[PDB]
Amino acid sequence: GRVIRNQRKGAGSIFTSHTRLRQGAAKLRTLDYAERHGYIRGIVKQIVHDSGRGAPLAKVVFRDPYKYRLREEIFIANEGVHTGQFIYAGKKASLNVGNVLPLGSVPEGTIVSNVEEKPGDRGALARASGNYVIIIGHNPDENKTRVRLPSGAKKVISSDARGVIGVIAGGGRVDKPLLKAGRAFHKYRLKRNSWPKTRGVAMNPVDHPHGGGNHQHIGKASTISRGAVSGQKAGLIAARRTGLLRGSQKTQ
Amino acid sequence: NPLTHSTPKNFGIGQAVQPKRNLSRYVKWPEYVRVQRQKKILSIRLKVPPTIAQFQYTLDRNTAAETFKLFNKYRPETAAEKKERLTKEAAAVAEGKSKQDASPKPYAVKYGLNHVVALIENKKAKLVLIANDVDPIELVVFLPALCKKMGVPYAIVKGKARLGTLVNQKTSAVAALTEVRAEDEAALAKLVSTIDANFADKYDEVKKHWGGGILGNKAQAKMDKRAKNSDSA
Amino acid sequence: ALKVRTSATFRLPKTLKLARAPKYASKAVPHYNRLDSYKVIEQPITSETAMKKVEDGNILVFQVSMKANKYQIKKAVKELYEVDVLKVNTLVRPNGTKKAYVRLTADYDALDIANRIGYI
Amino acid sequence: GAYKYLEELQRKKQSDVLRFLQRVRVWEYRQKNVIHRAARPTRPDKARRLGYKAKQGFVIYRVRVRR
Amino acid sequence: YATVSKTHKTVSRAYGGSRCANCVKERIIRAFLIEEQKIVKKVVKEQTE
RNA sequence: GAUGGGGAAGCUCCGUUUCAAAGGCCUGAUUUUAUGCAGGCCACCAUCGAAAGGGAAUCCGGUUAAGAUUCCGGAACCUGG
RNA sequence: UUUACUUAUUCAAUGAAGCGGAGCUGGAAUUCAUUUUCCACGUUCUAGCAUUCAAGGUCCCAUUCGGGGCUGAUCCGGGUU
Ligand SMILES: [K+]
Ligand SMILES: [Mg+2]
Ligand SMILES: [Mg+2]
Ligand SMILES: [Mg+2]
Ligand SMILES: [Mg+2]
Ligand SMILES: [Mg+2]
Ligand SMILES: [Mg+2]
Ligand SMILES: [Mg+2]
Ligand SMILES: [Mg+2]
Ligand SMILES: [Mg+2]
Ligand SMILES: [Mg+2]
Ligand SMILES: [Mg+2]
Ligand SMILES: [Mg+2]
Ligand SMILES: [Mg+2]
């Protein structure tokens, strides 16, 4: 008869992100005339750590084409990008690591990152460290580019959507065991209050569907219907299957 | 001459930050400006039923100028003229026991929506002018059909403000001639002939033609391109 | 309609801001000076410590209006007692009234001023 | 007068002319504020029937309410 | 810094108390060489057409 | 946490730069008056929020029954003009 | 049932800055050589710099100061995209 923890997270009282030390939202440049028709050159001034993020961020300074001033942008640094490097962004920029290109302007097989889902959204896909998007083909009529996402899903995106050539820096991060509750603590201290996790089966029935009983056990199937309501969606929500995965992935 | 030099600027992408250009096309206009413009756009993007869009036909410039020239000879009394008439009438009937007839019969343009509608129903009106910009259009949509049924020559004319300047108001939305002077009777007959040729004789045809349906600039260009490609090949 | 307007931002046009021309006065009588010298300086403080300050430090000790600042206290002392004031120190006493230590310039003897104004 | 024609025409709400006017005016009202001053009655005949007069001191306000 | 004369807050050079001497020298060399390369690139473009 | 807006029968709720016509400080000219008109430059925004965070500038000696980096004596510093 | 259109409605962004349609020019296919077509349209060795209605050109006025218009920076549609 009590509101469960995953229900309480939605209120965002103690579950908001700890954003104080963050460098700012990591976004591509606003899709403007310069990027739509030619290219614009910026300079990588700093490669800096972002609190709560595995991948480093790149501060790239461009010139404002309409007013005399500098515009600093916060890109997600791709591996191999260095300070003092010239970044070129636009339809006419070259196929070099760190450059921002429309997906249609790159050949099949190109590896991009910080890929826009829609043109002008300033980057949605393949933003985490070591992640990348593979261009697998173009549909020049009704211009669309087929891409493979880090999850392996195939997506059809507008050919005007932009991405950064290369792979997001900081790859191999999850290969190192955290080795310590303290290291997990410091990891999540700068992301959000989602750790540590009490098992629902170790709670009382009032606190969780898995709570109670003279032994710790679920009692009913942990696979929960997609049509279940809040307070019921604990366990494996809308699971197609369960158990140890054996064989090959990528069903088709 | 040898001290000054030519230094052309490279205003292409990535150089020589752009000069000030006319951005009036891109101005973020106030909400009321945007709303009135988009309302004018919507009123022609939709299909306009034939009762409306008969007002998109207005009297042409020359006939309108002639009509207002004739109507300007029958302006209603101003405050000063009415005061002078009142003095010349009271100070005459008091002395001479006149039957309030110390003034001649007036010839003035008839205005006011209810007054003009009643004159049309009674067939007193010899020429009705209906403004094409009555903002609630229901006030004058029936007027072309009422005039056609009562055999009253009517003209849809540009400007309720113009009719207002005719009748010493800001706007009038209507202006009617019921009686005209002898010296202007022939001009009235010729003007009525032209007006019937333009509006009343064409009413039975304009009553079957829907208005609007007009695409924007870019939609028009796109449809022209697709007709040039799919239809002409 | 055909002006250049080289900026895409439309701001509120500047219009005439007429100053107020009321048809009647708002108060109909200006209030007299709410803080004149005679209520800026409420009364001298004649405690033993204050009298020692008067005798030795050339400092007159006054109870002053709680609304009066150092400028007002200095002006009121100058007007009421015809003395130039070197320095004014003020405190709010624990009883909610304001005490002012007014050190006069070296040309004036605070003891003589106190004797002139009636407290010794 | 014209108020009687207004009254009769306003009862043909599913006619072509009133449907067109309904669409255009509903769009314009949705563009304006939820509550806003109207410069003049949209239906002067209805306003007169409900006691409005075209004199100073009479005010028309248009208001949007969730259905 | 508002209470000290200009001599304490600057250096007699092209960028005073903003850039160091080595960075100013590098800026000079880069500006000169890149403008020279711009001239030679312009003439190369003119003589490749 | 107001405003602009939207929700709510409503007490009020959301939202904090958002679908807003959100602005005064520089000055040629105006000096029939250094102003409105009218040359010409700039704003993705109220306010509150720390007596341990940031922050303009003071020290010594003496003095009271009880005040002291505050008073007295001497010697400085900062800000505004 | 499938398709089209956009102005209702919905989503997103921007200080609503370059949208759409033509035109100029730069190598190209051919014409019934009228005309029809494709692409591009001032930037890529370098952690420099790029702002004052941009100089220049041209026209007007008005003089010891200069100011203004056109072009530089093609035309049209005012649909911010
Ligand atoms: K259980
Ligand atoms: Mg765990
Ligand atoms: Mg656990
Ligand atoms: Mg337990
Ligand atoms: Mg339960
Ligand atoms: Mg259950
Ligand atoms: Mg147990
Ligand atoms: Mg004090
Ligand atoms: Mg009124
Ligand atoms: Mg609130
Ligand atoms: Mg504060
Ligand atoms: Mg502090
Ligand atoms: Mg003590
Ligand atoms: Mg001292």
PDB file of N, CA and C in Angstrom, chain B residues 96-147:
ATOM      1  N   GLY B  96     -42.913  84.041 -39.388  1.00  0.00           N
ATOM      2  CA  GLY B  96     -43.900  83.958 -40.446  1.00  0.00           C
ATOM      3  C   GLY B  96     -44.908  82.833 -40.381  1.00  0.00           C
ATOM      4  N   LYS B  97     -44.971  82.079 -39.281  1.00  0.00           N
ATOM      5  CA  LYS B  97     -45.916  80.969 -39.139  1.00  0.00           C
ATOM      6  C   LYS B  97     -45.781  79.971 -40.287  1.00  0.00           C
ATOM      7  N   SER B  98     -44.546  79.758 -40.736  1.00  0.00           N
ATOM      8  CA  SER B  98     -44.294  78.792 -41.794  1.00  0.00           C
ATOM      9  C   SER B  98     -44.471  77.370 -41.275  1.00  0.00           C
ATOM     10  N   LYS B  99     -44.830  76.465 -42.181  1.00  0.00           N
ATOM     11  CA  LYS B  99     -45.037  75.062 -41.825  1.00  0.00           C
ATOM     12  C   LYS B  99     -43.739  74.264 -41.905  1.00  0.00           C
ATOM     13  N   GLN B 100     -42.706  74.745 -41.210  1.00  0.00           N
ATOM     14  CA  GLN B 100     -41.396  74.095 -41.139  1.00  0.00           C
ATOM     15  C   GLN B 100     -40.775  73.870 -42.515  1.00  0.00           C
ATOM     16  N   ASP B 101     -41.266  74.566 -43.538  1.00  0.00           N
ATOM     17  CA  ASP B 101     -40.820  74.380 -44.914  1.00  0.00           C
ATOM     18  C   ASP B 101     -40.035  75.588 -45.418  1.00  0.00           C
ATOM     19  N   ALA B 102     -39.235  76.192 -44.542  1.00  0.00           N
ATOM     20  CA  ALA B 102     -38.317  77.248 -44.944  1.00  0.00           C
ATOM     21  C   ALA B 102     -37.012  76.702 -45.507  1.00  0.00           C
ATOM     22  N   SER B 103     -36.929  75.392 -45.718  1.00  0.00           N
ATOM     23  CA  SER B 103     -35.776  74.732 -46.304  1.00  0.00           C
ATOM     24  C   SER B 103     -36.231  73.830 -47.440  1.00  0.00           C
ATOM     25  N   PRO B 104     -35.413  73.672 -48.475  1.00  0.00           N
ATOM     26  CA  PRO B 104     -35.795  72.807 -49.593  1.00  0.00           C
ATOM     27  C   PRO B 104     -35.680  71.334 -49.232  1.00  0.00           C
ATOM     28  N   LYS B 105     -36.304  70.509 -50.065  1.00  0.00           N
ATOM     29  CA  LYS B 105     -36.213  69.067 -49.892  1.00  0.00           C
ATOM     30  C   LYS B 105     -34.758  68.627 -50.025  1.00  0.00           C
ATOM     31  N   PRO B 106     -34.227  67.862 -49.076  1.00  0.00           N
ATOM     32  CA  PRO B 106     -32.813  67.495 -49.135  1.00  0.00           C
ATOM     33  C   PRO B 106     -32.561  66.303 -50.042  1.00  0.00           C
ATOM     34  N   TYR B 107     -31.397  66.329 -50.683  1.00  0.00           N
ATOM     35  CA  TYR B 107     -30.908  65.224 -51.502  1.00  0.00           C
ATOM     36  C   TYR B 107     -29.574  64.789 -50.907  1.00  0.00           C
ATOM     37  N   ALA B 108     -29.577  63.662 -50.203  1.00  0.00           N
ATOM     38  CA  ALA B 108     -28.388  63.182 -49.519  1.00  0.00           C
ATOM     39  C   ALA B 108     -28.249  61.684 -49.729  1.00  0.00           C
ATOM     40  N   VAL B 109     -27.005  61.210 -49.672  1.00  0.00           N
ATOM     41  CA  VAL B 109     -26.744  59.780 -49.764  1.00  0.00           C
ATOM     42  C   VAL B 109     -27.291  59.091 -48.522  1.00  0.00           C
ATOM     43  N   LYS B 110     -28.012  57.994 -48.728  1.00  0.00           N
ATOM     44  CA  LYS B 110     -28.575  57.226 -47.628  1.00  0.00           C
ATOM     45  C   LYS B 110     -27.554  56.205 -47.146  1.00  0.00           C
ATOM     46  N   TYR B 111     -27.340  56.156 -45.833  1.00  0.00           N
ATOM     47  CA  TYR B 111     -26.370  55.247 -45.241  1.00  0.00           C
ATOM     48  C   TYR B 111     -26.958  54.651 -43.970  1.00  0.00           C
ATOM     49  N   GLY B 112     -26.200  53.751 -43.351  1.00  0.00           N
ATOM     50  CA  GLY B 112     -26.709  52.971 -42.243  1.00  0.00           C
ATOM     51  C   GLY B 112     -27.268  51.651 -42.727  1.00  0.00           C
ATOM     52  N   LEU B 113     -26.789  50.543 -42.157  1.00  0.00           N
ATOM     53  CA  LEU B 113     -27.114  49.225 -42.697  1.00  0.00           C
ATOM     54  C   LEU B 113     -28.613  48.945 -42.648  1.00  0.00           C
ATOM     55  N   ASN B 114     -29.243  49.165 -41.492  1.00  0.00           N
ATOM     56  CA  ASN B 114     -30.670  48.873 -41.366  1.00  0.00           C
ATOM     57  C   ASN B 114     -31.499  49.780 -42.266  1.00  0.00           C
ATOM     58  N   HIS B 115     -31.140  51.063 -42.325  1.00  0.00           N
ATOM     59  CA  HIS B 115     -31.852  52.011 -43.174  1.00  0.00           C
ATOM     60  C   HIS B 115     -31.767  51.602 -44.639  1.00  0.00           C
ATOM     61  N   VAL B 116     -30.566  51.250 -45.098  1.00  0.00           N
ATOM     62  CA  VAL B 116     -30.379  50.890 -46.500  1.00  0.00           C
ATOM     63  C   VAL B 116     -31.069  49.569 -46.813  1.00  0.00           C
ATOM     64  N   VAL B 117     -31.037  48.615 -45.879  1.00  0.00           N
ATOM     65  CA  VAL B 117     -31.739  47.352 -46.085  1.00  0.00           C
ATOM     66  C   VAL B 117     -33.236  47.593 -46.229  1.00  0.00           C
ATOM     67  N   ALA B 118     -33.795  48.462 -45.382  1.00  0.00           N
ATOM     68  CA  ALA B 118     -35.220  48.761 -45.475  1.00  0.00           C
ATOM     69  C   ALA B 118     -35.550  49.486 -46.776  1.00  0.00           C
ATOM     70  N   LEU B 119     -34.660  50.374 -47.228  1.00  0.00           N
ATOM     71  CA  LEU B 119     -34.885  51.052 -48.502  1.00  0.00           C
ATOM     72  C   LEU B 119     -34.833  50.071 -49.669  1.00  0.00           C
ATOM     73  N   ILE B 120     -33.936  49.087 -49.601  1.00  0.00           N
ATOM     74  CA  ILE B 120     -33.884  48.056 -50.632  1.00  0.00           C
ATOM     75  C   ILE B 120     -35.166  47.235 -50.627  1.00  0.00           C
ATOM     76  N   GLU B 121     -35.640  46.852 -49.438  1.00  0.00           N
ATOM     77  CA  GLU B 121     -36.869  46.071 -49.355  1.00  0.00           C
ATOM     78  C   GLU B 121     -38.073  46.858 -49.853  1.00  0.00           C
ATOM     79  N   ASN B 122     -38.067  48.176 -49.673  1.00  0.00           N
ATOM     80  CA  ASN B 122     -39.160  49.012 -50.152  1.00  0.00           C
ATOM     81  C   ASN B 122     -38.928  49.537 -51.562  1.00  0.00           C
ATOM     82  N   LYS B 123     -37.819  49.157 -52.199  1.00  0.00           N
ATOM     83  CA  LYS B 123     -37.512  49.538 -53.580  1.00  0.00           C
ATOM     84  C   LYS B 123     -37.356  51.048 -53.735  1.00  0.00           C
ATOM     85  N   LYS B 124     -36.958  51.731 -52.659  1.00  0.00           N
ATOM     86  CA  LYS B 124     -36.668  53.158 -52.754  1.00  0.00           C
ATOM     87  C   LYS B 124     -35.263  53.423 -53.273  1.00  0.00           C
ATOM     88  N   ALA B 125     -34.343  52.480 -53.089  1.00  0.00           N
ATOM     89  CA  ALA B 125     -32.948  52.705 -53.435  1.00  0.00           C
ATOM     90  C   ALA B 125     -32.740  52.558 -54.937  1.00  0.00           C
ATOM     91  N   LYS B 126     -32.105  53.563 -55.542  1.00  0.00           N
ATOM     92  CA  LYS B 126     -31.748  53.513 -56.951  1.00  0.00           C
ATOM     93  C   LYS B 126     -30.314  53.070 -57.191  1.00  0.00           C
ATOM     94  N   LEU B 127     -29.453  53.139 -56.178  1.00  0.00           N
ATOM     95  CA  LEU B 127     -28.088  52.635 -56.328  1.00  0.00           C
ATOM     96  C   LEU B 127     -27.508  52.348 -54.953  1.00  0.00           C
ATOM     97  N   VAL B 128     -27.186  51.085 -54.686  1.00  0.00           N
ATOM     98  CA  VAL B 128     -26.613  50.664 -53.410  1.00  0.00           C
ATOM     99  C   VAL B 128     -25.144  50.320 -53.621  1.00  0.00           C
ATOM    100  N   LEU B 129     -24.282  50.860 -52.765  1.00  0.00           N
ATOM    101  CA  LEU B 129     -22.868  50.527 -52.721  1.00  0.00           C
ATOM    102  C   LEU B 129     -22.587  49.785 -51.423  1.00  0.00           C
ATOM    103  N   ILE B 130     -21.998  48.600 -51.543  1.00  0.00           N
ATOM    104  CA  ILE B 130     -21.714  47.722 -50.414  1.00  0.00           C
ATOM    105  C   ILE B 130     -20.204  47.643 -50.250  1.00  0.00           C
ATOM    106  N   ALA B 131     -19.718  47.952 -49.052  1.00  0.00           N
ATOM    107  CA  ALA B 131     -18.286  47.883 -48.799  1.00  0.00           C
ATOM    108  C   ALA B 131     -17.803  46.440 -48.868  1.00  0.00           C
ATOM    109  N   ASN B 132     -16.605  46.250 -49.412  1.00  0.00           N
ATOM    110  CA  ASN B 132     -16.040  44.917 -49.570  1.00  0.00           C
ATOM    111  C   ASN B 132     -15.238  44.456 -48.360  1.00  0.00           C
ATOM    112  N   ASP B 133     -15.144  45.269 -47.308  1.00  0.00           N
ATOM    113  CA  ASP B 133     -14.274  44.962 -46.177  1.00  0.00           C
ATOM    114  C   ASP B 133     -15.015  45.055 -44.847  1.00  0.00           C
ATOM    115  N   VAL B 134     -16.302  44.719 -44.832  1.00  0.00           N
ATOM    116  CA  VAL B 134     -17.050  44.654 -43.581  1.00  0.00           C
ATOM    117  C   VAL B 134     -16.518  43.462 -42.789  1.00  0.00           C
ATOM    118  N   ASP B 135     -15.866  43.733 -41.653  1.00  0.00           N
ATOM    119  CA  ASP B 135     -15.084  42.690 -40.988  1.00  0.00           C
ATOM    120  C   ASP B 135     -15.935  41.514 -40.525  1.00  0.00           C
ATOM    121  N   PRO B 136     -17.066  41.698 -39.812  1.00  0.00           N
ATOM    122  CA  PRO B 136     -18.059  40.617 -39.764  1.00  0.00           C
ATOM    123  C   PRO B 136     -18.869  40.628 -41.050  1.00  0.00           C
ATOM    124  N   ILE B 137     -18.607  39.651 -41.918  1.00  0.00           N
ATOM    125  CA  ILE B 137     -19.142  39.719 -43.273  1.00  0.00           C
ATOM    126  C   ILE B 137     -20.628  39.395 -43.327  1.00  0.00           C
ATOM    127  N   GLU B 138     -21.179  38.765 -42.287  1.00  0.00           N
ATOM    128  CA  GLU B 138     -22.599  38.431 -42.290  1.00  0.00           C
ATOM    129  C   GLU B 138     -23.479  39.663 -42.425  1.00  0.00           C
ATOM    130  N   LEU B 139     -22.969  40.838 -42.049  1.00  0.00           N
ATOM    131  CA  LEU B 139     -23.766  42.054 -42.119  1.00  0.00           C
ATOM    132  C   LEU B 139     -24.158  42.403 -43.550  1.00  0.00           C
ATOM    133  N   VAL B 140     -23.339  42.034 -44.537  1.00  0.00           N
ATOM    134  CA  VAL B 140     -23.605  42.458 -45.909  1.00  0.00           C
ATOM    135  C   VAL B 140     -23.548  41.318 -46.922  1.00  0.00           C
ATOM    136  N   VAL B 141     -23.520  40.064 -46.464  1.00  0.00           N
ATOM    137  CA  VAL B 141     -23.462  38.958 -47.421  1.00  0.00           C
ATOM    138  C   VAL B 141     -24.786  38.819 -48.160  1.00  0.00           C
ATOM    139  N   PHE B 142     -25.900  39.032 -47.460  1.00  0.00           N
ATOM    140  CA  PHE B 142     -27.214  38.942 -48.080  1.00  0.00           C
ATOM    141  C   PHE B 142     -27.525  40.139 -48.965  1.00  0.00           C
ATOM    142  N   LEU B 143     -26.756  41.221 -48.849  1.00  0.00           N
ATOM    143  CA  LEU B 143     -27.075  42.447 -49.578  1.00  0.00           C
ATOM    144  C   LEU B 143     -27.031  42.278 -51.092  1.00  0.00           C
ATOM    145  N   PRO B 144     -26.022  41.633 -51.695  1.00  0.00           N
ATOM    146  CA  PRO B 144     -26.106  41.400 -53.148  1.00  0.00           C
ATOM    147  C   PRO B 144     -27.346  40.628 -53.558  1.00  0.00           C
ATOM    148  N   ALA B 145     -27.722  39.604 -52.791  1.00  0.00           N
ATOM    149  CA  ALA B 145     -28.881  38.798 -53.158  1.00  0.00           C
ATOM    150  C   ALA B 145     -30.180  39.544 -52.887  1.00  0.00           C
ATOM    151  N   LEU B 146     -30.229  40.315 -51.799  1.00  0.00           N
ATOM    152  CA  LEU B 146     -31.407  41.134 -51.533  1.00  0.00           C
ATOM    153  C   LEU B 146     -31.609  42.166 -52.635  1.00  0.00           C
ATOM    154  N   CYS B 147     -30.526  42.822 -53.057  1.00  0.00           N
ATOM    155  CA  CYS B 147     -30.618  43.795 -54.139  1.00  0.00           C
ATOM    156  C   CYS B 147     -31.031  43.129 -55.445  1.00  0.00           C
TER     157      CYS B 147
END
